[PDB]
Design a protein around this ligand. Structure first.
Ligand SMILES: OC[C@H]1O[C@@H](O)[C@H](O)[C@@H](O)[C@@H]1O
Ligand SMILES: OC[C@H]1O[C@@H](O)[C@H](O)[C@@H](O)[C@@H]1O
Ligand SMILES: OC[C@H]1O[C@H](O)[C@H](O)[C@@H](O)[C@@H]1O
Ligand SMILES: Nc1ccc(S(N)(=O)=O)cc1
Ligand SMILES: Nc1ccc(S(N)(=O)=O)cc1
Ligand SMILES: Nc1ccc(S(N)(=O)=O)cc1
Ligand SMILES: [Zn+2]
Length: 258
């Protein structure tokens, strides 16, 4: 009964070990596009990934993380709602058992097939661990995935998954360019929220891009061949690793675009 995504240990149970699950700033949320308001105070968003240094890909039993060298300002996120510089540490996805579900955020209640999270920490706090003690410690860039044409910049990820099928397996994953996971437009919504997995800490400025990326059915089908379980254990396919939308409470979602 470690946390997970089963009927016995999924999102409806997390509050028992992580009472912040019922907090005032939880994520994800439904993005009501008609209520979100353009904010002229937002500065231009800068996604600066040209010098990124990927290192490894890990099946952590809940998703797979592509990890980056964050020992210095190499891949960073600035501008928009953010004060200062946020350094890329890892990205991962959430996805469904079927194309009709998988995203964490929803857009006018619409669920996408998957959602990419590029996770960054505020460099003024020195390390990720200190950043998650702060109300402005993290910035997560969220990108929706729909199923259509293949995303060429995702294929290297897809093709390594057979080598990290089970929990605890990792593989080298150097020289991966995360620019290849972005859509064309950087239009976004933003709001203050939390990590979407335990420990559910309320440290995140969410920046959710409006434009989805398209991936092929074959690409997302390979996500669904991963396992939540470790090697040797009964196979439990890694699917439906998403938390549903949580109450908006006393928050407003701002839009970068008129
Ligand atoms: O290899 C992935 C990326 O790594 C970066 O460090 C390089 O500067 C980019 O040119 C390259 O696309
Ligand atoms: O009092 C007026 C203000 O209300 C706030 O809730 C909105 O975020 C602002 O955009 C608006 O100017
Ligand atoms: O860029 C990520 C990975 O893509 C492919 O798997 C390459 O064969 C490997 O060398 C690289 O680490
Ligand atoms: N019954 C139960 C208790 C706690 C959890 S947890 N680790 O997700 O909070 C899950 C199920
Ligand atoms: N330094 C570090 C990088 C990535 C991660 S991970 N596996 O949580 O993405 C943890 C620590
Ligand atoms: N450690 C951690 C980092 C990011 C997230 S998420 N799913 O909110 O990006 C959850 C936990
Ligand atoms: Zn996530």
């Amino acid at each position: 009964h470690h946390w997970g995504y089963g009927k016995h240990n999924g999102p409806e149970h997390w509050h028992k070990d992580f009472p912040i699950a019922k907090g005032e700033r939880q994520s994800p949320v439904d993005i009501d596009t008609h209520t979100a308001k353009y904010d002229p105070s937002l500065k231009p968003l800068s996604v600066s990934y040209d010098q990124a240094t990927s290192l490894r890909i890990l099946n952590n039993g809940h998703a797979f993380n592509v990890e980056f060298d964050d020992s210095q300002d190499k891949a960073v996120l600035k501008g928009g709602p953010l004060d200062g510089t946020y350094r890329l540490i890892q990205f991962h996805f959430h996805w469904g058992s079927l194309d009709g579900q998988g995203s964490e955020h929803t857009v006018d209640k619409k669920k996408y097939a998957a959602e990419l999270h590029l996770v960054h920490w505020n460099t003024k706090y020195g390390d990720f661990g200190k950043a998650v003690q702060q109300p402005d410690g993290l910035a997560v860039l969220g990108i929706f995935l729909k199923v259509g044409s293949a995303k060429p910049g995702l294929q290297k990820v897809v093709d390594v998954l057979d080598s990290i099928k089970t929990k605890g397996k990792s593989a080298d994953f150097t020289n991966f360019d995360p620019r290849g996971l972005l859509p064309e437009s950087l239009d976004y919504w933003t709001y203050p929220g939390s990590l979407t997995t335990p420990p559910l800490l309320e440290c995140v400025t969410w920046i959710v891009l409006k434009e989805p990326i398209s991936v092929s059915s074959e690409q997302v089908l390979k996500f669904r061949k991963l396992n939540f379980n470790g090697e040797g254990e009964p196979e439990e396919l890694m699917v439906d690793n998403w938390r549903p939308a949580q109450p908006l409470k006393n928050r407003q979602i701002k839009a970068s675009f008129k």
